[PDB]
Design a protein around this nucleic acid. Structure first.
Ligand SMILES: [Mg+2]
Ligand SMILES: [Mg+2]
Ligand SMILES: [Mg+2]
Ligand SMILES: [Mg+2]
Ligand SMILES: [Mg+2]
Ligand SMILES: [Mg+2]
Ligand SMILES: [Mg+2]
Ligand SMILES: [Mg+2]
Ligand SMILES: [Mg+2]
Ligand SMILES: [Mg+2]
Lengths: 238, 45, 234, 392
RNA sequence: UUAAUUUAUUAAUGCAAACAACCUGCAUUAAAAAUUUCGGUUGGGGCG
RNA sequence: GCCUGUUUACCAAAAACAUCACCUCUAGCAUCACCAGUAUUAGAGGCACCGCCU
RNA sequence: GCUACCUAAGAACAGCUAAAAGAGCACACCCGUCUAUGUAGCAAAAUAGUGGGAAGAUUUAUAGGUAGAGGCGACAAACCUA
């Protein structure tokens, strides 16, 4: 009944405006299904306003089978993605409920077994860089190993600085530019460098101009030439 | 120090090398059969 | 091997049951878990983890009297002998459970939240949100399996529909039907963390054998493009 | 959670051979061979019956087929029942009112020094020392040995008063006597099967301690109750039982009237030994059972207020601590909680000696405590003697 | 062991099979291992 | 090297191994080990009591 | 039936100092630091003295268990009938 659904949503935190917005959001979906999906979301721990915003963005979630939704919510809880952790993850990638559980599991398995990230580290990576889920396997491993071996960045730093957020093209461009300029240097077998390396935040997070001025101390023209040359070299290598 | 590895005890002797234990498994039965074929006076311990 | 589990008793009783140590060995006689063996001889007290177990030919909520609170060698938490009607049973005592106290075990999910008094058992649906709980079941009538160690306490985080979200002591969310029963308050022996073993002999008494003397040193296998930077010489 | 792991549970029989599932054919089994072979079907042997009665291979019928089986479950109290609530539970079960301290009628029997035994303290000390130190070749006699010995020696010491009291000739301390008594309490049928030991029988009944006015005044007293513990707790709930009331002796037995039930908790292990409260409860219940058996034998099996109350004494001891009880059964109408109530005078935790040293404790080669009792209390023995002399 | 050759075996997944799971077949990925080898000259050692 | 202890039976008894303490990783769970246990728990491992400064 | 570890149920630990101790001295008991003897020896690892522990993570009798692409290991690659 509409009365029952409205009473339940009057509970569970949702206000009258949010309930009306959700009813308008229903794209020919049963009120019972709406209630079940909202119940699953708040069980995961999303606050009513985040739930309303997410459903406003992607009403398709309302059509998900209830059994599939429950399985996915249990999997997310096991992964530790809940409450605020799941909030921004849904904000960035709303397809986590539509993605194949095999896709999510293989992403997590790549992060754990082939990248040796602890469970907490993997949860934090998922929380901070939801785009990793969309990113295909192989490319993610290459990015991680680029950070690990060539750049000499250890797992705690790779997690603290959202390195996996950035794209491999940008990472290679900036890092190889600095390496050939002499600013960056891969740590030796002992893990020591002649000159301390610039911070990952100083490399990737900063804008292009700030990266070229503060760290590289070169010209944008030279950077563009190097970017074209590196793109050509990558094409030839492939 | 060495040499006296044998500390006799009839309970252990019979429980480890007895007729019942030899018959308890096919391998022990084949052991008894081998002794019988060889003509051993003492088939079991 | 001729190993038969000592857990052969079929009828519940209050008497301590003579339990045989395993030494970390399987029924096959091979070590399966290391660092186990020896220690003080112990007797097992059968704990009734289904706190709402109405006596034979009886039903509905029932009260019980805490005959005593006792140290249990087989658990971190301490146990309580508690008697109701014409039976006695062992349960896991809560932080402030005292001899002579009264305990309530009910299966009634009242429309309003029941006043949460430590030590009593109510269905999770009957508890106010945020109350500390322990001896939580996974399914209705399964029996307490979670939050059983000393000083542990889960939190009834949420209640929606017939499903309650609990925060296990490992800070993990768990979904359980609100009809499943749990006891209020935190488990007893809260100071179990602060216990100092003091000497290796005390661990040996507890039955923990020393760790192996072997020195144990996986690794990220570099991809072919990255093999050139693994061991850059100094 | 079910008790008893699968691996320990009896193994399931192997599945039947498929040949047995074919209606038209008779399977070929190794039954004719009279021994197992692995390549023939397993026979389905019919159930076997010995055909006669072999006492050493007897299989009793199921509990439901026994002649005395009854749907109504009786609750039996025997020598080895340990009440959870102790004295309160015993009082509720027996419909009894407790009175602290022994009655003046018996306590005054020892006030005059004529009843005082000559060299009484010396004799009691010798009895204690014999029981605890000199009893056997072992250095430290066990309770199983010195509890019955101490009780018997105290009884003999009291019996020595036959000189002053010739009426002590009309009594005898019988052993292995067992009595049975049944009664109702709020629809609950309770039986007491008292075995214990050392029943002091007398040729004459004990005089009543409580007057009619006191017995009536017991009406106002309310029978203390305890919740949620039921009064039945710790009693053997049995569906196979007999309801007969037995005094333990055939009709015409000399010394028919019980005088004192001497209960002893001689178990060497503390857990196997009754707690003081549970021992007092057992004393109350056994005294009530013997008195009720006497009443049923005398005035018939009728629920009524007794015109002549039945008095039974009891001494429950662990070898060192004694408990004294005088129980007056003044009503067989036990079912209701209202009306005149039986009444028991109890003196609790009267410790004869607070400790005994079998060996001399030596510190720095200095004897601190000599061998022998320390903290001897003659008050307990005067109470013991008062009980023994009561009725004579 | 980042020597060569394998996944027979376990653990996962994918596709078939069969009506979600189990089982079977075929693949892929890991763990675990298994078989085998470690050419020649240059007093030895390093780099050659 | 914290300590008591353990070790190459038959050339090494030690600074080696273990060790309380601390630290890291893994696991939300019943009827044969772990465990008739349940995150203050269990397993795998590092290091070595405690105590300090940064 | 040795030995490594474990399971069941047992047993031993004088005396002194301290006090409830993986405490001190020191018997039995366990071990084996150093020296000497011995080296086809009493001995295929012993003897004498000296020494470490000796109420504990101790020692130990009995029965049972773990078996070789394995067991067991307070890792010595130690032990699993010289
Ligand atoms: Mg031996
Ligand atoms: Mg040392
Ligand atoms: Mg030492
Ligand atoms: Mg060892
Ligand atoms: Mg050696
Ligand atoms: Mg040496
Ligand atoms: Mg001593
Ligand atoms: Mg010592
Ligand atoms: Mg080594
Ligand atoms: Mg080596």
């Amino acid at each position: 009944e509409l009365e029952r659904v409205m009473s339940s949503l009057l509970d569970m935190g949702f206000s009258n405006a949010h309930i009306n917005e959700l009813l308008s959001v229903r794209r020919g979906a049963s009120l019972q299904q709406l209630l079940d999906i909202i119940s699953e979301f708040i069980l995961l721990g999303l606050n009513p306003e985040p739930v309303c915003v997410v459903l406003k963005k992607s009403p398709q979630l309302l059509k998900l089978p209830i059994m599939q939704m429950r399985k996915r919510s249990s999997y997310l809880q096991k992964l530790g993605l809940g409450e605020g952790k799941l909030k921004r993850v849904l904000y960035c990638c709303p397809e986590i409920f539509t993605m194949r559980q095999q896709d999510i599991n293989d992403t997590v398995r790549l992060l754990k077994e082939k990248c040796l990230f602890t469970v907490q580290q993997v949860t934090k990576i998922l929380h901070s860089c939801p785009s990793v889920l969309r990113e295909d396997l192989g490319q993610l491993e290459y990015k991680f190993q680029y950070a690990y071996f060539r750049m000499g960045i250890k797992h705690p730093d790779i997690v603290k600085s959202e390195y996996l957020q950035y794209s491999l093209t940008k990472i290679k461009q900036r890092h190889i530019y600095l390496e050939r300029l002499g600013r960056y240097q891969t740590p030796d077998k002992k893990g020591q460098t002649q000159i301390p390396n610039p911070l990952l935040k100083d490399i990737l997070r900063v804008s292009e101009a700030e990266f070229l001025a503060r760290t590289a101390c070169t010209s944008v023209e030279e950077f563009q030439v190097f970017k074209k040359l590196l793109a050509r070299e990558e094409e030839e290598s492939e | 120090a060495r040499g006296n590895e044998y500390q006799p005890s009839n309970i252990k002797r019979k429980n480890k090398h007895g007729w019942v234990r030899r018959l308890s498994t096919p391998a022990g039965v084949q052991v008894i059969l081998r002794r019988m074929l060889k003509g051993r006076k003492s088939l079991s311990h | 091997a001729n190993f038969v589990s000592w857990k052969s008793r079929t009828k519940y009783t209050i008497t301590p049951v003579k339990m045989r140590k395993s030494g970390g060995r399987d029924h096959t006689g091979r070590i399966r878990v290391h660092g186990i063996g020896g220690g003080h001889k112990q007797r097992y007290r059968m704990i009734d983890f289904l706190r709402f177990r109405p006596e034979e030919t009886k039903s509905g909520p029932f009260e019980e009297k805490v005959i005593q609170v006792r140290y249990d060698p087989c658990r971190s938490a301490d146990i309580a002998l508690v008697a109701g009607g014409s039976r006695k049973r062992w349960i896991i005592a809560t932080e402030n459970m005292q001899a002579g106290d009264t305990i309530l075990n009910s299966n009634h999910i009242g429309r309003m939240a029941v006043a949460a008094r430590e030590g009593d058992a109510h269905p999770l649906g009957a508890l106010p949100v945020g109350t500390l709980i322990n001896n939580v079941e996974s399914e209705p009538g399964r029996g307490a399996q979670y939050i059983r160690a000393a000083g542990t306490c889960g939190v009834l985080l949420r209640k929606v529909n017939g499903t309650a979200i609990i925060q296990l002591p490992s800070k993990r969310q768990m979904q359980v039907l609100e009809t499943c029963v749990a006891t209020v308050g935190r488990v007893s022996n809260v100071d179990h963390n602060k216990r100092v073993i003091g000497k290796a002999g005390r661990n040996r008494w507890l039955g923990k054998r020393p760790n192996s003397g072997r020195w144990h040193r996986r690794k990220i296998r570099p991809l072919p493009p990255m093999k050139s930077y693994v061991k850059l010489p100094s | 959670y079910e008790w008893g792991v699968r691996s320990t549970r009896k193994s399931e029989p192997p599945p039947l051979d498929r040949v047995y599932e074919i209606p038209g054919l008779e399977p070929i089994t190794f039954a004719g061979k009279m021994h197992f072979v692995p390549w023939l079907a397993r026979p389905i042997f019919p159930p076997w019956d010995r055909g006669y009665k072999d006492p050493r291979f007897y299989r009793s019928p199921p509990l439901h087929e026994h002649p005395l089986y009854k749907d109504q479950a009786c609750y039996i109290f025997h020598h080895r029942c340990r009440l959870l609530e102790g004295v309160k539970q015993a009082l509720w079960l027996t419909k009894t009112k407790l009175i602290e301290g022994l009655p003046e009628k018996v306590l005054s029997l020892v006030d005059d020094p004529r009843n005082h035994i000559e060299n009484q303290d010396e004799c009691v000390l010798n009895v204690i020392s014999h029981a605890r130190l000199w009893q056997t070749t072992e250095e430290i006699p066990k309770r199983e040995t010195y509890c019955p010995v101490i009780v018997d020696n105290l009884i003999q010491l009291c019996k020595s008063q036959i000189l002053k009291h010739p009426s002590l000739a009309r009594r005898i301390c019988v052993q292995n006597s067992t009595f049975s008594a049944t009664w109702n309490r709020e629809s609950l049928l309770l039986q007491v099967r008292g075995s214990g030991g050392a029943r002091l029988s007398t040729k004459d009944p004990l005089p009543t301690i409580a007057s009619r006015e006191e017995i009536e005044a017991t009406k106002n007293h309310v029978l203390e109750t305890f919740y949620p513990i039921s009064p039945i707790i710790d009693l053997h709930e049995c569906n196979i039982y007999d309801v007969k009331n037995d005094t333990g002796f055939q009709e015409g037995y000399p010394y028919p009237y019980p005088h004192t039930l001497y209960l002893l908790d001689k178990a060497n292990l503390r857990p196997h030994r009754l707690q003081p409260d549970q021992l007092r409860a057992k004393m109350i219940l056994f005294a009530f059972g013997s008195a009720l058996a006497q009443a049923r034998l005398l005035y018939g099996n009728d629920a009524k207020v007794l015109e002549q109350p039945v008095v039974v004494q009891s001494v429950g001891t662990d070898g060192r601590v004694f408990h004294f009880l005088v129980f007056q059964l003044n009503t067989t109408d036990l079912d209701c909680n209202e009306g005149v109530k039986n009444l028991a005078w109890v003196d609790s935790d009267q410790l004869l000696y607070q400790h005994f040293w079998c060996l001399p404790v030596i510190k720095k080669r200095v004897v601190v405590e000599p061998v022998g009792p320390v903290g001897f209390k003659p008050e307990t023995f005067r109470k013991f003697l008062a009980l023994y002399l009561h009725g004579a």
